[PDB]
Design a protein around this ligand. Structure first.
Ligand SMILES: OC[C@H]1O[C@](O)(CO)[C@@H](O)[C@@H]1O
Ligand SMILES: OC[C@H]1O[C@](O)(CO)[C@@H](O)[C@@H]1O
Ligand SMILES: OC[C@H]1O[C@](O)(CO)[C@@H](O)[C@@H]1O
Ligand SMILES: OC[C@H]1O[C@](O)(CO)[C@@H](O)[C@@H]1O
Lengths: 381, 381, 381, 381
């Protein structure tokens, strides 16, 4: 987890959402020291447990209700249970990662402090803060609008099914914990995206500095700068591995949630298309599909960018090798090439998969297959 | 995008088809200078928007018609919508790539000018021009014949369904924008194939020159030539990456269109086989399957050839290493081997997939699966 | 197969379960010498043949019985036959591997003796013995409890179907050989896990010793220690290959059994959910799913850990290269880096697949697909 | 294609089966010189065309017959057409490869002559001849027995369906060209297996010679021998590539035929199991499944062995590097290591796939999926 001053707003959002149970104090030097926040540790754990329990309580209440709104049919029951459970698993893994990633967070932020000292020329505090705030605000606004539209649509649907003997509006009101879980999931994804995008952006800054300083006393200082860049690259790779070690299970469950949600939302969209029962429902479902695709991108693109930018330092170093003659500088470039030869740049979600753009292809494949099988069964009866 | 005099006809075809919005002026030296053509930029954007709108207007008109010809049943409606949408997406991505790839086009053509100066011995302007013209003409003739056969078949089908109260021939006439989109797609594929085949052919010429000049003062000039070949190889790799960066989204949507069209056309072929309604329809559908397979090959084979030819320079350089003793020449060959060790040769379609022959296998797998699931559902009812 | 004093209990369990037909005598030095045990060789072969024959005899008896309990319907017959056959194949491959892996066992234990002499500082006999005994005891207790619950559930089910004219309890009693096969399978998995975890743990100990002795006369001895660590790494890789060569077919059939059991148990769980016939049956089936997942992990995690720990020596050696200057020590580190460059660390199950965590993903994919297809067919009729 | 005296019987079998249209004359030195055989070239082409035409003529005759025996139902018609077409495609690709692989055959046999001169110590003419003859004879006997059983079963089935007004035995007699195609396919597979096994066996002999001569004036001769072994390894890799370039399309169509035949034969086995119509049919179908699996192994195992043996020279060379000090010998070993670093050892079937044991896994996956989908559709109606 990256906790820097420009992105401190994302840290506070994650802290209140039970995802970053850390106490941060800003040094007189501008550095943010991080430590365990036992108050917020227990707050995060208790809030997650209570919200998961309330979500499943609302699910059971709807299922056992006189007139269920969402847990009506066996198919609807199964799909809604899966939909809620993937969110529960994703946010539970995220909260667990936040609870048990203090040491990795400290090491990552120390490494990033060193790297940013090395890459001071390419730093932009204003742009970084505004980008982080824009990402957090857009994600939170998107989930807020989507939750509002979903609640309105389901309230209308429950009212259409209302009978004087039973209230179906409270059935919808019992799904508020599920939407709270969705807000926590959005916060977790924003936090992870902030960290991974920071790593990829720093890799790009390192590559740009390399190209500027070697492709655009004095030789000794140049070699010292090349050494600093090599340590920065190695440290950024170790930071990517720290993010993997700390949040790979969260990323894996986010990916599982994304796949399940895409399949389930497309299936419900096509079921309502067959029924042609509520245009507002179709629009809300398409918005949900867009949101799930966008959060899949939010989790996949940062890691793809980080790996791609890390793996393109080899080419710059090869060109420098081809265009260098000083003995000390030539030795430094040879060492950098050796280092980059065996660099593992990809983000791993617990070793189950490598997180990059190829995942999208896999997802597409799976979705198509599952969508084709599910739709045909509905369309051949 | 490669814009050279021998293949200038392909460039003009792509320009009129809204895919190459560039102004080209031939230097007194025979070089083609490229710049933005704002007139043709707006022409391309407006033509694409108008043709997409007209295609979907014709689709809706058929769907809402008194006697739909193609958008008749829910299954037919879905499959026709997908068929049209994949073409729309492919040509829209191609036009977008053409609009926003001027800098990559300029860099690619500068690099190719340098490489062709290096590989002057193996150049064949006459053969290159005739190959490019033959590819463009065969592709355009194939799509023209296929569009004519499709229009005739659908006109006959609409006339067979005609009733005095409504005209079904205008329903067919409203699909002309879709066939225009098909012509644009053919132009885009011909352009991309021209560029990728040029890169693969230049890789092969480089390998042949290497083998001829090292396996078939003076030593200093030989080392200079080896250095020129090494820079040519690196530049061709960067050209492959320029083509990827500029047209990877277009290639990805071409691949998606190919997969969808193969599956959908095979499904309709087998549906009409079950119905046994029109032999001409079956022949036209088999021609469409052949065309979609051939355009899948047109997009996959050039990239496979480029990657394969790029990756076989390592073997020639290894043999030269094994058969060289001069100090300067030995150092040059060692540098070339180092360079080739870390060469990324494959064409990437936006990082989603690597474009080579293995894609065919994947496609086959997917098609088989989808074909098996779809056909069995139709055959078990 | 690893046969060491701390894990000798696992060896005896495997010996009685027909999986380790070896005679072991403890040297005065504490070394365990291993040789062929012809008495236990014939015992293992005969016991496996008799138990497989009795398992299939009980299966046929149930199928041909007046009131079959498990082999009732064609679907139930097929799924039960597959369930029994995967266990039979897994244990038969395990017993065959035990019979024909004496030379590999001897070489592996000699190599491990040398490695443990090298890594004496990080050895923990007490912890190793307690970990091995805990793994064996937990696995045996889990399978015992699961077999007891299964037998009780099936006895109750058979009694519910009992009629005065025929006894269905003997039908359940004829499945005892199948549960004996399950105990043998548990022993085989515990043995393989013990060996693979030993290899991964020794890789980790080697990496820790490297980091401690190089990142935390005298230089000559340090170089000698680095050489010892390099030989230890190469020997551990060869030990991983010995385990692969000896038990890859057993691991492959264990994986096949795991996939088939997960799919079949989930399918029966959902079938009984549709029927809602016996809550105890559902609980037993969920326990079986948990057990099959846990044994899939028991076979996949050790190999993933071994490969991961083997592949992270490259980074330590790279850092040492970056932080070393002595001529002899620098040459030693260069040799170690060369060695690690071309190290094949992954466990291979007969070349069919690489055993690591990605297998889980594959399994999940397959299961989902198969589960989706099977469930939908049941739910659309 | 390998044409050596020990395996000359396989060459003659392939020649008569239209697969090796070459004239071979044995030198006084024992070398076999190969040249184009125009007589046998036209014989091969004409025989293939005639047999394919007769096969499809018999297929159509059965389909159009009064009482079809095999081309009875739409499902049976489709599956039988696919079954015959995969064989036709495999043998047509094999015959085409034989026709257009004279230069590759000559280069491969020259390279093998050189390699066998280098590896004279490990040569065994008697064992090689007996192994080749045993493989050819076992394959031919297996296909002969299977064809006889199939013909007998189908003759009995046709007689059971015979009516006095029409003869169904001639319907079976019209499938003789299909069985002739099967004999040609067996010959092609035996030829390809002979060549690929020769390459893998020579790789193993090279590795054994390396280990014996370096791990079990004088130093100059030892270095010369190491150089000879390095050229032998490079030449064997080029021989593997020659086999790929010449017969990759044949191997690809053999693999496609194997997958289709396994799926189709399993499907027909389960269909007859549902019908329970003829026990002899079930036994013949299981024999066909065994034969198709065994020929899949015959095509997959040789390439897996060749690649595996080629890729294990790196380890021997690394150990020699670690255990060598002579300047010339150390340089020779360094060159060999450099060479092996970038060796592409795998057999490629036209770039579509790499032929090794992982293919089996893929096949299994596909088969399972397809088998599950096909069987469930039959079992849910
Ligand atoms: O299921 C359709 C959509 O509704 C939600 O459950 C929100 O309540 C989303 O998870 C899903 O995208
Ligand atoms: O759908 C069958 C065929 O007809 C087309 O739509 C052309 O109008 C093609 O896209 C397709 O190959
Ligand atoms: O089939 C459900 C479960 O019952 C067993 O067969 C045990 O008898 C297990 O193999 C399986 O997990
Ligand atoms: O189809 C079942 C079997 O019968 C054959 O067609 C032979 O005539 C084989 O190709 C197949 O294995």
């Amino acid at each position: 987890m990256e906790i820097s001053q420009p992105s401190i707003g994302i840290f506070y959002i994650s802290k209140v959402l039970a995802l970053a149970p850390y106490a941060t104090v800003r040094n007189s030097k501008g550095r943010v020291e991080i430590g365990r926040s036992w108050l917020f540790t227990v707050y995060s754990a208790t809030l997650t447990v209570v919200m998961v329990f309330l979500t499943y309580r609302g699910l059971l209440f709807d299922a056992n209700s006189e007139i269920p709104v969402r847990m009506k049919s066996a198919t609807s029951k199964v799909v809604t249970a899966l939909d809620v459970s993937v969110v529960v698993m994703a946010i539970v893994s995220g909260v667990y990662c936040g609870l048990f990633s203090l040491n990795d967070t400290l090491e990552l932020n120390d490494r990033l402090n060193k790297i940013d000292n090395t890459l001071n020329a390419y730093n932009n505090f204003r742009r970084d803060r505004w980008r982080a705030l824009g990402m957090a605000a857009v994600s939170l606004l998107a989930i807020s609008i989507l939750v509002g539209l979903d609640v309105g649509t389901w309230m209308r649907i429950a009212q259409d099914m209302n009978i004087a003997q039973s209230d179906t509006e409270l059935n919808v009101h019992w799904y508020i914990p599920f939407y709270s879980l969705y807000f926590i999931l959005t916060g977790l994804q924003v936090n992870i995206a902030n960290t991974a995008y920071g790593l990829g952006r720093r890799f790009g800054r390192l590559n740009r500095m390399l190209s500027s300083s070697f492709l655009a006393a004095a030789a000794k200082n140049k070699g010292l700068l090349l050494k600093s860049l090599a340590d920065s690259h190695e440290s950024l790779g170790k930071c990517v591995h720290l993010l993997s070690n700390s949040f790979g299970i969260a990323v894996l469950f986010i990916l599982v949630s994304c796949l399940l949600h895409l399949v389930a939302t497309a299936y419900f969209l096509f079921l309502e298309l067959l029924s042609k029962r509520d245009n507002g429902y179709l629009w809300v479902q398409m918005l949900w599909i867009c949101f799930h695709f966008l959060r899949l991108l939010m989790v996949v693109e940062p890691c793809h960018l980080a790996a791609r930018e890390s793996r393109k330092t080899i080419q710059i170093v090869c060109e420098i090798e081809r265009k260098v003659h000083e003995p000390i500088l030539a030795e430094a470039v040879k060492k950098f090439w050796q280092q980059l030869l065996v660099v593992d740049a990809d983000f791993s979600a617990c070793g189950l998969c490598r997180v990059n753009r190829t995942i999208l292809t896999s997802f597409a494949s799976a979705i198509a297959t599952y969508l084709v099988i599910l739709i045909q069964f509905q369309r051949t009866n």
